[PDB]
Design a protein around this ligand. Structure first.
Ligand SMILES: C=C(CC[C@]12O[C@H](C(=O)O)[C@@](O)(C(=O)O)[C@](C(=O)O)(O1)[C@H](OC(=O)/C=C/[C@@H](C)C[C@@H](C)CC)[C@H]2O)[C@@H](OC(C)=O)[C@H](C)Cc1ccccc1
Length: 284
Protein backbone atom coordinates (compact mmCIF):
# COMPACT_ATOMS: atom_id res chain seq x y z
CA UNK A 1 0.00 0.00 0.00
CA UNK A 2 1.16 3.49 -0.90
CA UNK A 3 0.15 6.21 1.56
CA UNK A 4 -2.55 7.41 -0.86
CA UNK A 5 -4.03 3.88 -0.89
CA UNK A 6 -4.27 4.10 2.93
CA UNK A 7 -6.12 7.44 2.56
CA UNK A 8 -8.70 5.90 0.21
CA UNK A 9 -8.99 2.75 2.38
CA UNK A 10 -9.81 4.97 5.33
CA UNK A 11 -12.49 6.76 3.27
CA UNK A 12 -13.84 3.33 2.35
CA UNK A 13 -13.99 2.35 6.06
CA UNK A 14 -16.17 5.39 6.76
CA UNK A 15 -18.52 4.49 3.90
CA UNK A 16 -18.71 0.76 4.80
CA UNK A 17 -19.51 1.29 8.48
CA UNK A 18 -22.30 3.86 8.01
CA UNK A 19 -23.77 3.31 4.56
CA UNK A 20 -26.43 0.63 4.82
CA UNK A 21 -27.79 1.46 1.34
CA UNK A 22 -25.39 3.52 -0.86
CA UNK A 23 -22.44 1.19 -0.15
CA UNK A 24 -23.79 -1.83 -2.05
CA UNK A 25 -24.42 0.18 -5.23
CA UNK A 26 -21.31 2.31 -5.35
CA UNK A 27 -19.00 -0.66 -4.79
CA UNK A 28 -20.48 -2.17 -7.96
CA UNK A 29 -18.65 0.60 -9.88
CA UNK A 30 -15.14 0.19 -11.35
CA UNK A 31 -12.13 0.96 -9.11
CA UNK A 32 -11.17 4.56 -10.01
CA UNK A 33 -14.79 5.74 -9.81
CA UNK A 34 -15.47 3.72 -6.64
CA UNK A 35 -12.45 5.29 -4.91
CA UNK A 36 -13.49 8.80 -5.90
CA UNK A 37 -17.03 8.10 -4.57
CA UNK A 38 -15.58 6.87 -1.24
CA UNK A 39 -13.68 10.15 -0.80
CA UNK A 40 -16.74 12.22 -1.72
CA UNK A 41 -18.98 10.16 0.58
CA UNK A 42 -16.50 10.43 3.44
CA UNK A 43 -16.19 14.24 3.02
CA UNK A 44 -19.99 14.75 2.83
CA UNK A 45 -20.58 12.50 5.85
CA UNK A 46 -18.01 14.45 7.87
CA UNK A 47 -19.82 17.65 6.86
CA UNK A 48 -23.20 16.22 7.93
CA UNK A 49 -21.72 14.80 11.18
CA UNK A 50 -19.84 17.93 12.24
CA UNK A 51 -23.10 19.63 13.17
CA UNK A 52 -25.50 16.72 13.88
CA UNK A 53 -23.09 14.84 16.14
CA UNK A 54 -19.61 16.17 16.99
CA UNK A 55 -21.27 19.53 17.62
CA UNK A 56 -18.98 22.34 16.46
CA UNK A 57 -19.09 25.15 13.91
CA UNK A 58 -15.29 25.13 13.98
CA UNK A 59 -14.88 21.57 12.64
CA UNK A 60 -17.24 22.58 9.81
CA UNK A 61 -15.18 25.77 9.33
CA UNK A 62 -12.10 23.53 9.12
CA UNK A 63 -13.70 21.34 6.45
CA UNK A 64 -14.59 24.39 4.36
CA UNK A 65 -11.11 25.85 4.67
CA UNK A 66 -9.49 22.53 3.71
CA UNK A 67 -11.69 22.35 0.58
CA UNK A 68 -10.83 25.99 -0.21
CA UNK A 69 -7.11 25.18 0.10
CA UNK A 70 -7.53 22.31 -2.42
CA UNK A 71 -9.44 24.56 -4.87
CA UNK A 72 -6.88 27.39 -4.75
CA UNK A 73 -3.75 25.18 -4.71
CA UNK A 74 -4.63 21.70 -6.01
CA UNK A 75 -0.94 20.65 -6.31
CA UNK A 76 0.53 22.07 -3.09
CA UNK A 77 1.06 20.15 0.15
CA UNK A 78 -1.51 21.30 2.74
CA UNK A 79 -1.56 20.77 6.50
CA UNK A 80 -5.26 19.97 6.51
CA UNK A 81 -7.16 21.22 9.55
CA UNK A 82 -10.14 18.82 9.44
CA UNK A 83 -9.55 15.14 8.62
CA UNK A 84 -6.14 14.73 6.91
CA UNK A 85 -6.77 11.34 5.28
CA UNK A 86 -10.12 12.37 3.81
CA UNK A 87 -8.75 15.70 2.46
CA UNK A 88 -5.64 14.11 0.93
CA UNK A 89 -7.92 11.70 -0.95
CA UNK A 90 -10.28 14.49 -2.07
CA UNK A 91 -7.24 16.51 -3.28
CA UNK A 92 -6.12 13.45 -5.26
CA UNK A 93 -9.58 13.25 -6.85
CA UNK A 94 -9.54 17.01 -7.67
CA UNK A 95 -6.21 16.65 -9.43
CA UNK A 96 -7.96 14.18 -11.77
CA UNK A 97 -11.54 15.49 -12.05
CA UNK A 98 -13.26 18.89 -12.32
CA UNK A 99 -14.77 19.23 -8.84
CA UNK A 100 -17.66 21.68 -8.56
CA UNK A 101 -16.29 23.36 -5.43
CA UNK A 102 -19.19 25.87 -5.18
CA UNK A 103 -21.44 22.83 -4.74
CA UNK A 104 -19.48 21.78 -1.67
CA UNK A 105 -19.83 25.36 -0.36
CA UNK A 106 -23.61 25.33 -0.95
CA UNK A 107 -23.78 22.00 0.91
CA UNK A 108 -21.80 23.41 3.84
CA UNK A 109 -24.01 26.54 4.04
CA UNK A 110 -27.12 24.34 4.03
CA UNK A 111 -25.75 22.15 6.80
CA UNK A 112 -24.83 25.34 8.80
CA UNK A 113 -28.33 26.80 8.35
CA UNK A 114 -29.95 23.50 9.28
CA UNK A 115 -28.22 23.77 12.68
CA UNK A 116 -31.31 25.57 13.90
CA UNK A 117 -34.01 23.51 12.22
CA UNK A 118 -36.74 25.96 11.45
CA UNK A 119 -39.55 23.94 9.88
CA UNK A 120 -40.08 24.70 6.20
CA UNK A 121 -42.93 27.08 5.50
CA UNK A 122 -43.34 26.14 1.84
CA UNK A 123 -42.49 23.29 -0.52
CA UNK A 124 -40.11 25.77 -2.22
CA UNK A 125 -37.99 25.91 0.94
CA UNK A 126 -38.13 22.14 1.41
CA UNK A 127 -36.99 21.69 -2.19
CA UNK A 128 -34.33 24.40 -1.68
CA UNK A 129 -33.05 22.27 1.19
CA UNK A 130 -33.20 19.09 -0.95
CA UNK A 131 -30.98 20.97 -3.38
CA UNK A 132 -28.55 22.10 -0.63
CA UNK A 133 -27.99 18.72 0.98
CA UNK A 134 -28.31 16.40 -1.98
CA UNK A 135 -28.58 18.23 -5.36
CA UNK A 136 -25.14 19.63 -4.50
CA UNK A 137 -23.83 16.08 -3.98
CA UNK A 138 -25.19 14.99 -7.36
CA UNK A 139 -23.32 17.98 -8.85
CA UNK A 140 -20.05 16.98 -7.11
CA UNK A 141 -20.49 13.38 -8.34
CA UNK A 142 -21.22 14.37 -11.98
CA UNK A 143 -17.66 14.26 -13.39
CA UNK A 144 -17.13 10.95 -11.56
CA UNK A 145 -20.25 9.30 -12.94
CA UNK A 146 -20.03 10.67 -16.47
CA UNK A 147 -17.57 11.76 -19.17
CA UNK A 148 -19.90 14.55 -20.30
CA UNK A 149 -19.78 17.75 -18.34
CA UNK A 150 -22.72 19.38 -20.03
CA UNK A 151 -25.66 21.29 -18.54
CA UNK A 152 -27.85 18.18 -19.05
CA UNK A 153 -25.55 15.86 -17.13
CA UNK A 154 -25.37 18.12 -14.06
CA UNK A 155 -29.11 18.73 -14.19
CA UNK A 156 -29.89 14.99 -14.20
CA UNK A 157 -27.39 14.32 -11.42
CA UNK A 158 -28.80 17.17 -9.33
CA UNK A 159 -32.40 15.92 -9.79
CA UNK A 160 -31.35 12.36 -8.95
CA UNK A 161 -29.77 13.53 -5.66
CA UNK A 162 -32.76 15.70 -4.71
CA UNK A 163 -35.22 12.85 -5.42
CA UNK A 164 -33.08 10.46 -3.35
CA UNK A 165 -33.30 13.06 -0.58
CA UNK A 166 -37.08 13.02 -0.92
CA UNK A 167 -37.18 9.18 -0.66
CA UNK A 168 -35.03 9.45 2.45
CA UNK A 169 -37.55 11.91 3.94
CA UNK A 170 -40.46 9.62 3.04
CA UNK A 171 -38.79 6.61 4.69
CA UNK A 172 -37.63 8.31 7.86
CA UNK A 173 -40.54 10.51 9.01
CA UNK A 174 -41.00 8.70 12.36
CA UNK A 175 -37.28 8.52 13.09
CA UNK A 176 -36.93 12.19 12.08
CA UNK A 177 -39.82 13.15 14.36
CA UNK A 178 -38.08 11.56 17.37
CA UNK A 179 -35.07 13.75 16.52
CA UNK A 180 -37.21 16.91 16.52
CA UNK A 181 -37.28 17.05 12.73
CA UNK A 182 -40.24 17.35 10.38
CA UNK A 183 -39.41 17.97 6.70
CA UNK A 184 -42.91 18.18 5.25
CA UNK A 185 -43.75 21.87 4.72
CA UNK A 186 -46.05 23.84 7.02
CA UNK A 187 -48.06 24.88 3.96
CA UNK A 188 -48.54 21.22 2.97
CA UNK A 189 -49.18 19.83 6.49
CA UNK A 190 -51.81 22.58 6.85
CA UNK A 191 -53.50 21.82 3.51
CA UNK A 192 -53.77 18.07 4.27
CA UNK A 193 -54.73 18.57 7.95
CA UNK A 194 -51.77 16.57 9.28
CA UNK A 195 -50.10 16.95 12.63
CA UNK A 196 -47.02 14.72 12.73
CA UNK A 197 -46.87 14.43 16.53
CA UNK A 198 -50.57 13.52 16.55
CA UNK A 199 -49.99 10.87 13.90
CA UNK A 200 -46.87 9.60 15.69
CA UNK A 201 -49.08 9.06 18.76
CA UNK A 202 -52.34 7.86 17.18
CA UNK A 203 -51.32 5.84 14.11
CA UNK A 204 -51.47 6.51 10.37
CA UNK A 205 -54.70 8.18 9.18
CA UNK A 206 -56.11 9.05 5.76
CA UNK A 207 -55.07 12.70 5.81
CA UNK A 208 -51.51 11.45 6.47
CA UNK A 209 -51.48 8.78 3.74
CA UNK A 210 -52.67 11.49 1.33
CA UNK A 211 -49.92 13.91 2.36
CA UNK A 212 -47.30 11.17 2.19
CA UNK A 213 -48.48 10.08 -1.29
CA UNK A 214 -48.51 13.69 -2.53
CA UNK A 215 -44.74 13.84 -1.93
CA UNK A 216 -44.16 10.23 -3.12
CA UNK A 217 -45.78 11.06 -6.47
CA UNK A 218 -43.33 13.96 -6.89
CA UNK A 219 -40.44 11.61 -6.12
CA UNK A 220 -41.69 8.96 -8.59
CA UNK A 221 -42.16 11.41 -11.51
CA UNK A 222 -38.67 12.79 -10.89
CA UNK A 223 -37.13 9.32 -11.01
CA UNK A 224 -38.95 8.49 -14.28
CA UNK A 225 -37.38 11.63 -15.81
CA UNK A 226 -33.91 10.69 -14.53
CA UNK A 227 -34.45 7.24 -16.06
CA UNK A 228 -35.51 8.84 -19.35
CA UNK A 229 -32.05 10.44 -19.40
CA UNK A 230 -29.93 7.54 -18.08
CA UNK A 231 -27.52 7.77 -21.04
CA UNK A 232 -25.90 11.04 -19.90
CA UNK A 233 -24.00 8.84 -17.44
CA UNK A 234 -20.98 6.66 -18.34
CA UNK A 235 -21.76 3.14 -19.50
CA UNK A 236 -20.47 1.58 -16.27
CA UNK A 237 -22.42 3.99 -14.02
CA UNK A 238 -25.69 3.61 -15.90
CA UNK A 239 -26.61 0.22 -14.39
CA UNK A 240 -25.67 1.49 -10.90
CA UNK A 241 -27.76 4.65 -11.32
CA UNK A 242 -30.66 2.50 -12.56
CA UNK A 243 -30.41 0.31 -9.44
CA UNK A 244 -30.56 3.50 -7.31
CA UNK A 245 -33.78 4.68 -8.93
CA UNK A 246 -35.15 1.13 -8.57
CA UNK A 247 -34.26 0.70 -4.89
CA UNK A 248 -35.76 4.16 -4.24
CA UNK A 249 -39.09 2.97 -5.67
CA UNK A 250 -38.77 -0.28 -3.70
CA UNK A 251 -38.41 1.76 -0.49
CA UNK A 252 -41.66 3.60 -1.31
CA UNK A 253 -43.46 0.27 -1.73
CA UNK A 254 -42.02 -1.11 1.52
CA UNK A 255 -43.30 1.97 3.39
CA UNK A 256 -46.69 1.43 1.70
CA UNK A 257 -46.64 -2.30 2.51
CA UNK A 258 -45.89 -1.40 6.14
CA UNK A 259 -48.96 0.88 6.07
CA UNK A 260 -46.86 4.07 6.25
CA UNK A 261 -45.58 3.24 9.75
CA UNK A 262 -43.82 5.91 11.82
CA UNK A 263 -42.44 3.24 14.17
CA UNK A 264 -39.87 1.26 12.15
CA UNK A 265 -37.22 1.91 9.52
CA UNK A 266 -38.21 -0.05 6.42
CA UNK A 267 -35.21 -1.31 4.44
CA UNK A 268 -34.58 -3.29 1.28
CA UNK A 269 -32.75 -6.56 2.04
CA UNK A 270 -29.26 -6.89 0.54
CA UNK A 271 -30.37 -10.15 -1.16
CA UNK A 272 -33.33 -8.31 -2.75
CA UNK A 273 -31.00 -5.55 -3.97
CA UNK A 274 -28.97 -8.25 -5.68
CA UNK A 275 -32.17 -9.58 -7.28
CA UNK A 276 -33.05 -6.13 -8.55
CA UNK A 277 -29.53 -5.54 -9.90
CA UNK A 278 -29.50 -8.89 -11.70
CA UNK A 279 -32.83 -8.02 -13.36
CA UNK A 280 -31.47 -4.62 -14.39
CA UNK A 281 -28.07 -5.30 -15.91
CA UNK A 282 -29.10 -8.28 -18.03
CA UNK A 283 -30.49 -5.45 -20.17
CA UNK A 284 -26.95 -4.04 -20.53
C1 LIG B 1 -24.72 12.27 5.16
C2 LIG B 1 -25.05 11.61 4.04
C3 LIG B 1 -25.49 10.17 4.18
C4 LIG B 1 -26.94 10.13 4.60
C5 LIG B 1 -27.35 8.69 4.86
O1 LIG B 1 -27.45 8.42 6.26
C6 LIG B 1 -27.89 7.10 6.64
C7 LIG B 1 -27.50 6.90 8.08
O2 LIG B 1 -26.67 7.70 8.58
O3 LIG B 1 -27.99 5.96 8.73
C8 LIG B 1 -27.30 6.01 5.74
O4 LIG B 1 -25.98 5.68 6.19
C9 LIG B 1 -28.10 4.73 5.83
O5 LIG B 1 -29.32 4.76 5.60
O6 LIG B 1 -27.50 3.67 6.12
C10 LIG B 1 -27.24 6.49 4.29
C11 LIG B 1 -26.57 5.51 3.36
O7 LIG B 1 -27.11 4.41 3.10
O8 LIG B 1 -25.45 5.83 2.91
O9 LIG B 1 -26.49 7.69 4.35
C12 LIG B 1 -28.60 6.97 3.78
O10 LIG B 1 -28.73 6.80 2.37
C13 LIG B 1 -29.94 6.08 1.98
O11 LIG B 1 -30.85 5.94 2.78
C14 LIG B 1 -29.99 5.50 0.63
C15 LIG B 1 -31.12 4.97 0.16
C16 LIG B 1 -31.21 4.32 -1.21
C17 LIG B 1 -32.35 4.93 -2.01
C18 LIG B 1 -29.83 4.39 -1.87
C19 LIG B 1 -29.85 4.05 -3.35
C20 LIG B 1 -29.54 5.31 -4.15
C21 LIG B 1 -28.88 2.92 -3.65
C22 LIG B 1 -27.80 3.39 -4.60
C23 LIG B 1 -28.61 8.47 4.05
O12 LIG B 1 -29.75 8.96 4.76
C24 LIG B 1 -24.94 12.19 2.66
O13 LIG B 1 -24.33 13.48 2.68
C25 LIG B 1 -25.26 14.54 3.02
C26 LIG B 1 -24.73 15.94 3.02
O14 LIG B 1 -26.42 14.26 3.28
C27 LIG B 1 -24.00 11.33 1.82
C28 LIG B 1 -22.67 11.08 2.53
C29 LIG B 1 -23.87 11.97 0.43
C30 LIG B 1 -23.27 11.04 -0.62
C31 LIG B 1 -23.99 9.96 -1.12
C32 LIG B 1 -23.42 9.12 -2.09
C33 LIG B 1 -22.15 9.39 -2.59
C34 LIG B 1 -21.44 10.48 -2.11
C35 LIG B 1 -22.00 11.31 -1.13
Amino acid sequence: MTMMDMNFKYCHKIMKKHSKSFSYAFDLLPEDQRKAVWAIYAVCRKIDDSIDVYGDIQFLNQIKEDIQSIEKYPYEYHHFQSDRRIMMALQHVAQHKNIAFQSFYNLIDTVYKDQHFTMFETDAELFGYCYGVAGTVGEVLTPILSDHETHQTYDVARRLGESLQLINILRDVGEDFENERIYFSKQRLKQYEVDIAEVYQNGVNNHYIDLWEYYAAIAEKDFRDVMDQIKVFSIEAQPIIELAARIAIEILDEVRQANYTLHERVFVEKRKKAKLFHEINSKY
